[PDB]
Amino acid sequence: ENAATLQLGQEFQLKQINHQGEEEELIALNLSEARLVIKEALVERRRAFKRSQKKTREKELESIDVLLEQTTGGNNKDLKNTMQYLTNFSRFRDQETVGAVIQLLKSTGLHPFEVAQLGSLACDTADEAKTLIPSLNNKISDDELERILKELSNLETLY
Amino acid sequence: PQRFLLPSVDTATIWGVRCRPGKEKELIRKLLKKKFNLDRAMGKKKLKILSIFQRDNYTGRIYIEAPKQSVIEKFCNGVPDIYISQKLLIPVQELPLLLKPNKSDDVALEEGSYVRIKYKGDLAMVDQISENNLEVMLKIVPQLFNPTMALRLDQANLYKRDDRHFTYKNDYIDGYLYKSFRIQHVFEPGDHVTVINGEHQGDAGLVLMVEQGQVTFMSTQTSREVTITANNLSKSIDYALHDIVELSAKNVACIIQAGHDIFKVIDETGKVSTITKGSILSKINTARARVSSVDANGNEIKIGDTIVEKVGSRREGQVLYIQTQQIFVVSKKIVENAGVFVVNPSNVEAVREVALGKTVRIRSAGYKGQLGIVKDVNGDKATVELHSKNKHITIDKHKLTYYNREGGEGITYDELVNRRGRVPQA
Amino acid sequence: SERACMLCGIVQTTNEFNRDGCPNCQGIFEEAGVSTMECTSPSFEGLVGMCKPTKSWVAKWLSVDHSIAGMYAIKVDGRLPAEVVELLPHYKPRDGSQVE
Amino acid sequence: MFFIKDLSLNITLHPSFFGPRMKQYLKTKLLEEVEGSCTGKFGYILCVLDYDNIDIQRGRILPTDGSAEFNVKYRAVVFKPFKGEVVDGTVVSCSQHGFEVQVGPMKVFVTKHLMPQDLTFNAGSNPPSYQSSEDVITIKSRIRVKIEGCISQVSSIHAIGSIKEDYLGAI
DNA sequence: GCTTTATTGAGGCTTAAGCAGTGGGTTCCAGGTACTAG
DNA sequence: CTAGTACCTCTTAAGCCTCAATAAAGC
């Protein structure tokens, strides 16, 4: 059974295997980093297709939609819905902001899922954060939690 | 009274003796006769055997009530099919149930009940039961009795006792035969659930509400709420498909979701509709259906041929059936409508031997003038077995002359094709 | 064919019943004004060869202690005539109905 | 839930397609499988990254058949909901039993019995909506709800949630 | 000093094994007995 | 009366238990 009490499944272990057999620590990402990696993958796919063939909430959405249509477009309609869901209510628009956020979250050293939730979900009070994740109650100090929450709130982009 | 019949060690002593199964009755009779003979002969000295019995359900064993084992061994000595050595003492507490009559598997007969006759295998209805509980009146289907046919055929043995009572060959009422037979001869919302019993057996869905033992669930197959008794639902841990159905004289559809009594079918016009089992007149056999169409390129297309649409999505698939103006094609790469779509033939592109059984003579070959029997023709060549040689040779039929079954004149391959196929006159 | 009496359970051929009837219940049948055949049934289960009914516990269990030695049926299907039942207040059917 | 991991996929290729472009063709078949995939074991596959860095292992030839089986290992980001998490979505449709909320590639349903007492369905507006003493819910609204149950389909994932704790609902 | 021990071994009985392939000609629809339908 | 229908009927290789002796521990 999977729940919020860190009772992950047989495959969602704290350690992950690499293509070379090396064991690494599980790494998570937030919505902004997910969008960044998706955009990088789309750019790489577009470049691959081009080389193979050779031999403010109003304009970015259109560019993303046309890019999706050009490459990996029409195979499934769920990709467009997921892209719209990610783009409509995103938080960070700059790579520097997400980089700083992930660098700060690295110092905490908490579970990847917990830090991902903290960087994605929005909280304003200690009690709300504690009740949101009862498992992560006696793990993070109240002062540290408040500091990270206010830092994340300040780092929020003004759209 | 039965409370005073409880067996005791000092009063009841029965020993079980193994015997060849099935011979229980004959063995019991033989032992009883032997005991009577011994009593008549010996006189005062009589073996202490009180009773000898057996149980039908317990084959291969008999029971003898005697005070001592030695008496039983002496009495049974020399009796074939009885293993005196293989014997055991019956405990007192087990004596009652041994003599307790077995509960007959036949349910208590009641008027109007349905039973099976052991008209073997024909359902019957119990109409009346005799006061002695030895014979029962059963109503059965004789097809229903037809007074018209009986009158037409065997009016001599047919009699009319009432407006709906007819006697034939010694009693038919309302088209059914009444005959006497011996009795011995006769959950929480969101939970995944599945129907195990009822009209909707096999349906699966997600529960939404439970009240007074009735569970309502939304079914994926029908996309509607169905309310069923809780006892008929089981919590599950989280015509066939593609058949051709003749909806009417001019309507043919292909099934995309084969259910128990509900079938979803796409018609020749591409419209998908849900119908009942009764709406299907009959099933069209694709293999036996000799229907062919012409594609855009003019190449003939038959059932099972792989075709690709020239316009649209260029769907590739195998043709299941051919309609007068449409063709149904099933594709393994399409999940929508079970991969079955109806397309126009013009919008797709594909990816009687008279000689047989008649004696013949060859004309221009190494076996000319030799009688032969035609077996089969592969097209432009006829296979013939020679009477004097145990070999089959393929030779062009045009250079062979046909003869009558019994002698007759020789005719080349110019009269049978022109004139009606008939053997010459001897 | 062999039939077993529904009153005492004695099993005998139909010819014997037609000729002499039940040796142990002829008087009761005559008093009840019923034929032997109506008081006998052809369906029975199990065979019991009773040799000493007075000294045999099986006879007491089958209520044939006062009967004579011979062949008897443990279970007999059917019902006796109402007249016979009226003359036997303590009659117990041998079909297993009263063996609960 | 937005996890990057290595996935190994076995792809069968006919020996006829053996030219230099086969790689690209293989990649195309990879793009037609990972995209839109939804398996209960690995959850829903979101995206595959590092297209140019994809490494393909040496193909495996069947003992008798001429097909080549290539085992390609690739790093991909996938999404999988878990019980007790809270996610935000957009109402897609309204019904008497509740309103479905599209979140990512998945759908969420809220049980009527687990709704605020003040919140009440109303059909007086076109389309029907819900009215609350201090909140307004319509088709076009961002609603944050907690997921309490997950259901896995052949090619879909469904969630069952409720809104009882504070700070939930319209935001 | 005597008695009762765990151990050693030695055979009877038992249950298993029993070249590869292939061509053909014969025989079974089993016997009696009782119960029951036309 | 007559005929269905079923129900009864030669040469070895291992395991194990069963026998006859033998040195030590109790007492």
**Domain ranges across chain A:** 1-28, 29-53+56-159
What is the amino acid identity at position A2?
N
Class of domain D1-84: alpha beta
Tell me whether B96 touches chain D (CB under 8 Å).
no
Burial of D31 (0-12, 13-18, 19+ CB in 10 A): middle
Class of domain D85-171: mainly beta
d(CA C92, CA C88): 9
Residue C4 bridge partners (DSSP): C11, C41
Dihedral pair phi/psi, residue D121, rounded to 5°: -70, 145
d(CA B62, CA B58): 9
Q: Cβ B133–C77 below 8 Å, yes or no?
A: yes
Q: Give the domain A29-53+56-159 fold.
A: Growth Hormone; Chain: A; (1.20.1250)
d(CA B133, CA C81): 11
Comparing alpha-carbon positions, the chain D residue that sits nearest to B335 is D155
H, E, C per residue of C54-66: CCCHHHHHCCCCC
Q: Count other C-beta atoms under 10 Å from residue C3's C-beta.
A: 24
Closest partner CB to A29 (pick from D2, D24, D82) = D2
Footprint of strand F on the protein (CB under 7 A): B 20-23, 59, 120
The secondary element (H helix, E strand) that includes residue A61 is helix A60-70
Pairing status of strand B300-301 against strand B293-294: antiparallel
Residue D102 bridge partners (DSSP): D90, D107
**Residue C55: both structure tokens together:** 């000294």
What residue spans of D96-152 are helical by DSSP H?
none
Q: Does D127 sit behind a cis peptide bond, omega within 30 degrees of 0 on the bond before it?
A: yes
Resolution in angstroms for this experimental structure?
4.3
Q: What is the DSSP string of B42-74?
A: H-S------EEEE-SSSTTEEEEE-S-HHHHHH
B102-C26-B28 Cα angle (round to 5)? 40
The secondary element (H helix, E strand) that includes residue B158 is strand B158-162
**Residue B118: both structure tokens together:** 């052991």
Closest partner CB to D111 (pick from B190, B192, B238) = B190
Overall size of chain C counted in residues = 100
How many domains is chain C built from? 1
d(CA A23, CA A17): 5
Delimiting residues of CATH 3.30.1490.120 domain(s) in chain D:
1-84
Rg (CA), chain A: 19
Overall size of chain B counted in residues = 426
d(CA C46, CA C30): 28
Residue C42: strand, helix, or coil? coil
d(CA B367, CA D82): 87
d(CA B343, CA B325): 9
Chain F bases under 7 Å from protein CB?
5, 7-9
Rg (CA), chain D: 22
Q: At what angle do helices A112-120 and A95-108 cross, to 10 degrees?
A: 140
Burial of D59 (0-12, 13-18, 19+ CB in 10 A): middle
Shortest Cα–Cα distance, B238 to chain D (Å): 7
CB of B400 within 8 A of CB of B360? yes
Q: Collect all residues of chain A within an 8 Å Cβ-Cβ radius of residue D103.
A: 85
Q: What are the CB-based long-range contacts (under 8 Å, 24+) for A46-53?
A: A46/A70, A46/A71, A47/D52, A48/D27, A48/D51, A48/D52, A52/D24
Shortest Cα–Cα distance, C24 to chain B (Å): 18
**Residue B46: both structure tokens together:** 């009589």
Separation in Å, CA B109 to CA B178, B375, B377, D137: 16, 67, 69, 66
Dihedral pair phi/psi, residue B120, rounded to 5°: -60, 135
| Strand nucleotide closest to residue B26 (CA to C1') | E33
Q: List chains touching C (3+ CB pairs under 8 A).
A: B
Question: Of B71, B77, B78, B80, whose CA–CA distance to B15 is shortest?
Answer: B71
Q: Collect all residues of chain C within an 8 Å Cβ-Cβ radius of residue B24.
A: 47
B positions 230-289 inside 8 Å of D (CB): 238
What residue spans of chain D are helical by DSSP H?
22-31
Q: List the domain range (segments joined by +) for residue C11.
A: 1-98
Closest partner CB to B100 (pick from C52, C58, C99) = C99
Q: Which residue has the tokens 């690709």?
A: B308
